[PDB]
């Protein structure tokens, strides 16, 4: 109806401003992988572990390339 569409606008707004904070901090993420990371951080997860996960997968993608 209406309240199911206002939330869609209010989540497009935050997924844009989080991308802006991502690009001034020069993180290598894009719009698609950031939507995975914010979803993971919603349920409650250690950022010190998930950041180590990403810093290992991005270090192992170069040995295969």
């Amino acid at each position: 109806a209406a309240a199911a569409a206002a939330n869609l606008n209010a989540v497009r707004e935050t997924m844009d401003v989080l991308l802006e904070i991502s690009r001034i901090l020069n993180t290598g993420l894009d719009m698609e992988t950031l939507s995975i990371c914010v979803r993971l951080c919603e349920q409650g997860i250690n950022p010190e572990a998930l950041s180590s996960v990403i810093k290992e997968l991005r270090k192992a993608t170069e040995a295969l390339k």
Partner: peptide, 23 residues
């Protein structure tokens, strides 16, 4: 799924008598 719907086509309309959430 919701971030997949979030990639939609937005309406860039606005009025002066509609300030809060007016697409």
């Amino acid at each position: 799924l919701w971030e997949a719907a979030l990639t939609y086509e937005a309406s860039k309309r606005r009025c002066w008598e509609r300030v809060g959430c007016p697409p």
